[PDB]
RNA sequence: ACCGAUAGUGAACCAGUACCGUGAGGGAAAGGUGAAAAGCACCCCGGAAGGGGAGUGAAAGAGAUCCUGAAACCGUGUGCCUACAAGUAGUCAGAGCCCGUUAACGGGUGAUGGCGUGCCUUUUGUAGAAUGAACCGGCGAGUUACGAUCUCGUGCAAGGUU
RNA sequence: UAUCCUUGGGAGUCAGACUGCGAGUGAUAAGAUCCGUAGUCGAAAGGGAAACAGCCCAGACCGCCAGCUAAGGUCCCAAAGU
RNA sequence: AACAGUGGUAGGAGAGCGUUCUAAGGGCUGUGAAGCCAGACCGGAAGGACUGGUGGAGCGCUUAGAAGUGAGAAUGCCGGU
């Protein structure tokens, strides 16, 4: 029996266009060009789910620098201090959540400064 | 205000607020205690890697669903490689209560 | 409101968006006059249709023709007429006659 | 879920004086202040810096032979269009581009670069017009 | 003499800025009241400046 | 054996290893016969021995 | 366990025609109103063409290459954004403003930041200044016939089978 | 520590590159060519070497707004000690 | 349950998705199917539904069998642009 192959295709090509909203110009009404862009998004949406493991550290660590220079300390003397102040686990994201409560943050800082000496 | 360890991640915890935390061993009606607590706050009582003593802040487990759908389409450009795998991450809608400060 | 369509009189649409990008929003009693000393000749189609567009509002609708403002007047292209102009060294260029559907929407101010 | 401050920033006015120091290490910790990297509420994209006024820029110093060596090259677009200027040329003729060009390289590039760059200004001598904002006095770490 | 690429739907529709045409100098016919072209004859009036000229 | 529930003994039926439909299954582009060989063209090639 | 109008006879239709060729020959394109022509009297606009009403029909957007009518493409409007920014055009952070859906760690824009050079063929090697495609839609490539051989599976087995 | 051999169905590959040591050809010229043994690439993304198949680290089932180190880095772009 | 492994081209191997047609059952349709048009639903994937709007007569599921079996690239054919 012969296959027409009528609606096998036209259902599939619009599962790519509906994943292709918002694009510049002629990449939201073409199959052959948005399919080079749904694919190309897939690497980008993959490999930039791992920079949130990186460019949040780079967002967290310089805030801890900034909390340290109003205390005279480094980023080194904090984290090397906190390994000896306690054996504390403060996971540099939530270190900033004490920074925005800076009255309580420096009790965590100057305790390590006493444990620097 | 607690900082509790559940699945290797910690969250700044306010009592009475829903926080999306990892899947665990409850059945949507339980009050699972969190014992790995540090920096209680408010009265500023910390214990430096022991946990804060006798302070096992509980919660109440509400709901366990799945996340918004994420599909990886990881293709290697030349030499004809595709890889198309969806991933529904499960979670637990955790309603937090009873700071045991 | 009113509605009137020219429907497939032969003029090319990209020679009919131009004057039609003046007429919309205007006063209808003024737009008869704006369509009179145009010199471009895509106007005696439209001025022969806007004059027909008023009469629908006057006969079929009696909506006080001095109180009308065109809300929409949009030109969409219609079906074409394909020719084969002969050219240099057997080349047979295609001349596409175009045809357009001049539409006019008349409403009360 | 961090705090990304966006235009809710209490900006500041610091003054860094240029008595006798080296313009690399005097533009060093100014450039962090131009983006406000010393401030604890540092978002990396919404310009959390604060304004910097430099006084007495022409009295700034250089060790080595850099008073004669470090030729500041600008270029036109016309062919063979470099225009050489040495340091002592920049120092005495007009030095109000002599610290700007030492920080234009040190602020990060992009649309946000020039947006942070507007916060800078440099006055020859002891002008300091600026009597309407209560500017503060800053001292560098070294 | 070859367009190296097709023109996209931006740089086409940025060329139709100064392809627009205006309304000409259009005043009112002082006698028969209708809209007049500036410094020409109001053909409905048949007049100019005082005289319906035959 | 009802007509509603026809099934074989498992191992007596086996689907096609059909050749040349998409790179997902493998055998997509080259269709199992490699790169540009004489052993890839339209029937041209070798005797058995 | 044939095709359903690019399929099936080249030809479902005035098709071996129309056209191309002096010539032997080559050789297209094009089916669908409804159940019933009941196919629009009548009134306006214009010379009509063509509408807008009215009336017909259950439907008139069903009205003459007349069912369904997608995409290219041409648009008319408006929600948010833009005239100191270079930017394979996305991603991921991300305020403001606009939102209220198959009711859930929502919808749409995104000022700005960080990483970032298409797909394919062929190559030791490609974003390639190596080829391929204007895009849009449809067709279009490892099939059966017979025998060989092996594994899996069936029934009888020192007999199996026509 | 488990991978070998035998029998049988099925292949593709027979144009390769470069860095170090061991030689030839050359001019102890080539990102040259002909090989030896060892890598990587080919078929292997990530980080550094500004960017870069072939060098220096290291292998990607997939998600997190967590933790530690290697190569290389810590005045500022561009994370970390003036 | 425990332990271990999961990059992959040529290349082998194993599982499934889906269209057309048939086969028994079942059902579902003028109280609106197929198609088409939209979305914020689910399944690991090819995918699959569910309301809403179009349309005006047919088509899904469960298990089987047959295949002209699924497009995005042929200086591709044929229209539309």
UniProtKB/Swiss-Prot annotation, chain A:
Domain of life (superkingdom): Bacteria
Pfam families: Ribosomal_L20
InterPro entries: Ribosomal_bL20, RIBOSOMAL_L20_CS, Ribosomal_protein_bL20_C
GO biological process, one term: ribosomal large subunit assembly
PANTHER family from the UniProt entry: 39S RIBOSOMAL PROTEIN L20 (PTHR10986)
Subunit structure: Part of the 50S ribosomal subunit.
Described purpose of this protein according to its UniProt entry: Binds directly to 23S ribosomal RNA and is necessary for the in vitro assembly process of the 50S ribosomal subunit. It is not involved in the protein synthesizing functions of that subunit.
NCBIfam families: rplT_bact (TIGR01032)
The protein's name in its UniProt record: Large ribosomal subunit protein bL20
Curated annotation (Swiss-Prot), chain D:
UniProt-listed GO biological process terms: negative regulation of translation; translation
Coiled coil region boundaries: none
SUPFAM superfamilies assigned: Ribosomal protein L13
The UniProt record lists the keyword Repressor: no
Pfam families hit by this protein: Ribosomal_L13
GO CC annotation, single: cytosolic large ribosomal subunit
Annotated keywords: Ribonucleoprotein, Ribosomal protein
A GO MF term: structural constituent of ribosome
HAMAP family cross-referenced by the UniProt entry: Ribosomal_uL13 (MF_01366)
Self-association state and partner proteins as the record states: Part of the 50S ribosomal subunit. Binds to Obg (AC P20964).
Family membership: Belongs to the universal ribosomal protein uL13 family.
Function: This protein is one of the early assembly proteins of the 50S ribosomal subunit, although it is not seen to bind rRNA by itself. It is important during the early stages of 50S assembly.
Protein name (database record): Large ribosomal subunit protein uL13
Encoding gene, per UniProt annotation: rplM
UniProtKB/Swiss-Prot annotation, chain E:
One annotated GO molecular function: structural constituent of ribosome
InterPro entries reported in the protein's UniProt record: Ribosomal_bL32, Ribosomal_bL32_bact, Ribosomal_zn-bd
Source domain of life: Bacteria
Assigned GO CC terms: large ribosomal subunit
BP GO annotations: translation
Keyword Lyase (UniProt): no
Protein keywords: Ribonucleoprotein, Ribosomal protein
The protein's assembly and partners: Part of the 50S ribosomal subunit.
Similarity comment: family membership: Belongs to the bacterial ribosomal protein bL32 family.
PANTHER family from the UniProt entry: 50S RIBOSOMAL PROTEIN L32, LARGE RIBOSOMAL SUBUNIT PROTEIN BL32
HAMAP family: Ribosomal_bL32
Protein name as annotated: Large ribosomal subunit protein bL32
Organism this protein belongs to: Bacillus subtilis (strain 168)
Swiss-Prot record, chain F:
Domain of life: Bacteria
Comp. bias regions, Basic and acidic residues: 1-13
Biased composition (Gly residues): 21-31, 42-49
Chain spans, region Disordered: 1-49
Disulfide bond entries: none
Function: Binds to the 23S rRNA.
Similarity comment: Belongs to the universal ribosomal protein uL15 family.
Subunit structure comment from the entry: Part of the 50S ribosomal subunit.
UniProt name for this protein: Large ribosomal subunit protein uL15
Source organism per UniProt: Bacillus subtilis (strain 168)
Classification lineage: Bacteria, Bacillati, Bacillota, Bacilli, Bacillales
């Amino acid at each position: 029996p012969r296959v027409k192959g009528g609606t096998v295709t036209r259902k599939r090509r619009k599962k790519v266009l509906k994943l292709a909203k918002g694009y510049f110009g002629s990449k939201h009404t073409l199959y052959k060009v948005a399919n080079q862009q749904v694919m190309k998004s897939g690497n980008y949406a993959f490999r930039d789910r791992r920079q949130k493991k990186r460019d949040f550290r780079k967002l967290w660590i310089t805030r801890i620098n900034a909390a340290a220079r109003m205390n005279g300390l480094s980023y080194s003397r904090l984290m090397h201090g906190l390994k000896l102040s306690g054996i504390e686990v403060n996971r540099k994201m939530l270190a900033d959540l004490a920074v925005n409560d800076l009255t309580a943050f420096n009790q965590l800082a100057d305790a390590a400064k006493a444990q620097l000496n | 205000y607690a900082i509790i360890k559940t699945g290797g991640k910690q969250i700044k915890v306010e009592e009475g607020q829903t926080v999306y935390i990892e899947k665990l061993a409850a059945e949507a009606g339980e009050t699972v205690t969190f014992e790995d607590v540090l920096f209680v706050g408010g009265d500023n009582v910390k214990v430096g890697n022991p946990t804060v003593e006798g302070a096992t802040v509980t919660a109440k487990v509400e709901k366990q669903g799945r996340a918004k759908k994420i599909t990886v389409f990881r293709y290697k450009p030349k030499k004809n490689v595709h890889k198309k795998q969806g991933h529904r991450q499960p979670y637990t809608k955790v309603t937090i209560e009873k700071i045991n400060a | 409101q009113a509605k009137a369509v020219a429907r497939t009189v032969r003029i090319a649409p990209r020679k009919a968006r131009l004057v039609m990008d003046l007429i919309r929003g205007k006063q209808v009693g003024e737009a008869v006059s704006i369509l009179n000393l145009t010199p471009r000749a895509a106007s005696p189609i439209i001025e022969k249709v806007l004059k027909s567009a008023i009469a629908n509002a006057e006969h079929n609708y009696e909506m006080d023709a001095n109180n009308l403002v065109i809300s929409q007047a949009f030109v969409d292209e219609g079906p074409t007429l394909k020719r084969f102009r002969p050219r240099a060294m057997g080349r047979a260029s295609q001349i596409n006659k175009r045809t357009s559907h001049i539409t006019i929407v008349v409403s009360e101010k | 879920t961090p705090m990304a401050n966006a235009s809710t920033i209490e900006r500041k006015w610091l003054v860094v004086d240029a008595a006798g120091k080296t313009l690399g290490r005097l533009s060093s910790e100014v450039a962090a202040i131009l983006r406000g990297k010393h401030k604890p509420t540092y978002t990396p994209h919404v310009d959390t810096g604060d304004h910097v006024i430099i006084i007495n820029a022409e009295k700034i110093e250089l060790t080595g032979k850099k008073l004669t060596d470090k030729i500041y090259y600008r270029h036109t677009q016309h062919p063979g269009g470099l225009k050489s200027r040495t340091a002592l040329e920049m120092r005495t003729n007009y030095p109000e581009k002599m610290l700007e060009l030492a920080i234009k390289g040190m602020l990060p590039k992009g649309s946000l670069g020039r947006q942070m760059f507007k916060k800078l200004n440099v006055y020859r001598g002891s002008e300091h017009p600026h009597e309407a904002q209560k500017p503060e006095v800053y001292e560098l770490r070294g | 003499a070859v367009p190296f690429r097709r023109t996209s739907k931006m740089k086409k529709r940025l060329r139709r800025t100064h392809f627009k045409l205006n309304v000409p100098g259009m005043t009112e016919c002082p006698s028969c009241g209708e809209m007049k072209l500036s410094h020409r004859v109001c053909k409905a009036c048949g007049s100019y400046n005082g005289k319906d000229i035959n | 054996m009802k007509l509603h529930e026809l099934k074989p003994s498992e191992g007596s039926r086996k689907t096609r290893n059909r050749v040349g439909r998409g790179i997902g299954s493998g055998n997509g582009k080259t269709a199992g016969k490699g790169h540009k060989g004489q052993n890839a063209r339209s029937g041209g090639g070798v005797r058995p021995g």
